[PDB]
Design a protein around this ligand. Sequence first.
Ligand SMILES: O=C([O-])C(=O)[O-]
Ligand SMILES: O=C([O-])C(=O)[O-]
Ligand SMILES: [Fe+3]
Ligand SMILES: [Fe+3]
Length: 689
Amino acid sequence: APRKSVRWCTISPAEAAKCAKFQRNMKKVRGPSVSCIRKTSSFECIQAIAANKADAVTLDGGLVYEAGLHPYKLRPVAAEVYQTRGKPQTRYYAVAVVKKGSGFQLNQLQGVKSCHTGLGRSAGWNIPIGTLRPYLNWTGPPEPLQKAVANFFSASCVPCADGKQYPNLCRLCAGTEADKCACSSQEPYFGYSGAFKCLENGAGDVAFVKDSTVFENLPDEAERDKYELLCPDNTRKPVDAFKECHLARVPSHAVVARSVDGREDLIWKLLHRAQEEFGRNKSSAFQLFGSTPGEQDLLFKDSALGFVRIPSQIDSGLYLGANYLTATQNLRETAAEVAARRERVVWCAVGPEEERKCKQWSDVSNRKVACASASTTEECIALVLKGEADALNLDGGFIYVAGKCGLVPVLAENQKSQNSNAPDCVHRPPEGYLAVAVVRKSDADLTWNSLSGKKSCHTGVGRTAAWNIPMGLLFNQTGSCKFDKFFSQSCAPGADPQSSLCALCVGNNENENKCMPNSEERYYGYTGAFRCLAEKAGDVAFVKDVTVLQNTDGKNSEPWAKDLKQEDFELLCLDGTRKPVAEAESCHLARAPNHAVVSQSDRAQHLKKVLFLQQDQFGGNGPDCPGKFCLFKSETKNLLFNDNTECLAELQGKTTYEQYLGSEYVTSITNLRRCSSSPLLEACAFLRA
Ligand SMILES: O=C([O-])C(=O)[O-]
Ligand SMILES: O=C([O-])C(=O)[O-]
Ligand SMILES: [Fe+3]
Ligand SMILES: [Fe+3]
């Protein structure tokens, strides 16, 4: 029944002390007990936490990165919230502060003395150095980055820098005997504030710090006017114009904990009580976000508004973002590797079969396209968000998720529509597809109004024609969020493997991977959803009209398909009526938006280019189509794109998910959410907050 204490990790005496002050006042307030361990650098704490010696530590974005790397695998539990000069924030701008009357611009730092927070930190190293890589004249990875920087900066103070090999790196650092250049507050030039004393005490010429460090030290606007900011456009701007004059916007410091058995909630309990009891002028007996003048930013960031709990799918990569991640991974890659990645396009393929086709696409494209893969669509989208993949075609349902996370639709699928299959396609307005409810002509008993307790087949949970269109209509007539109870048993890949929804599913061939939301599940997709209805494992199938047409009347030859005939099938009309498959225009549940390709608004243009070429080579009228590759085909498995796609068309203006999906559907998707939400949809609300 009782639950233990959080062992907080400290890096230097002063910090140990404050930590003790913290433990003290905490028990005095009969709140969660703390313990204070002692190491000599955050790098040491990461190790200490990973080896189960400590439990938490506040870290800078840059170290969050290091922490989440393999051997350690830590994860950000809570993020500090900040000033903003406006609305509080979990992001800050890294900047380069300089004195007025020094003349040099950003592209002229060669030979200057520089003061840095510490080796490894966002705005004290990762951001400025990455920005200055182009002037470093440095090989790449085999050659130590430090050997590069040390040669550029005439002398600097970069705490934790191997001053033994690179003495120019520690040169300007003040600090007694072995105190000099320490990776803690021992070294007086450590952190946003030391980087500023090192600047202000005229020891260096430029300081790479946070957007507020100046104001944190110069309360009087007169003091400030003696300083300026190096803008990335080789101009200088006043210290208060950081929104415009910044090297970059990094994510806030965070409290990291182990990934397995890290006691996240003990940690959050602690912090929650601490803010409430000692945060913003709660107390006077102890102040959490305040430190001494000899040393600042002790334990946490002085004057942080508090913390926000970080959701649980969120790992360092998702936390940092593509942008930050890339630049950080960039300082550890050669110019060629970097350059390579920026020009290829990395598709995310979902599950085993999509990846094989992806591999073919790769070789046949002479690697203009490379591949990445994940078992589930959300996993692909996360890859798209960490920046490991660049795009993936998605169904209305998930276009919505992608959008909620800030990805935009690039181009949309255009099935072999019907008017003039001349060049129209790429400019043909996407016309969507009719979602329908299909039942066999046999069970003539069955109708819309008698679906209750019958068995059902679904393409997948989260998808338009299956999930989103019927479920949204039923939840209407039934007023209940009990989705797994409406239909007797069902198959809807992606559902709880232990719920009724996963009951009718079958897994792959030797029946493993039952219910998985990918091709492994034989009943996944519009095809699988139909097979289900057809192998008599289900009574009603929710797919788009065409699905019937493309698998009956010999068209599909797979054992199950072969003998089907469009005649054996009918459509359940909303008004209880029944019409044959072909009648669909007068008996559909709804008209959904074509699947569409999505990417970060960043890559969209490049992405569009490559896609327009690739599809011109192996597309619907691709010259090397049957020849060496057909992008839009896969033997009815609908791999990567639907097998009836003529081309990937323009969005006709609909450039945001809300515009693309349209008012109604976006709405209709939110109402349902009243019933359910997802860890991704949840992780993104935070990340895009
Ligand atoms: O933490 C740091 O050093 C930074 O943000 O620059
Ligand atoms: O993609 C789906 O599942 C659909 O359109 O029904
Ligand atoms: Fe920082
Ligand atoms: Fe769809």
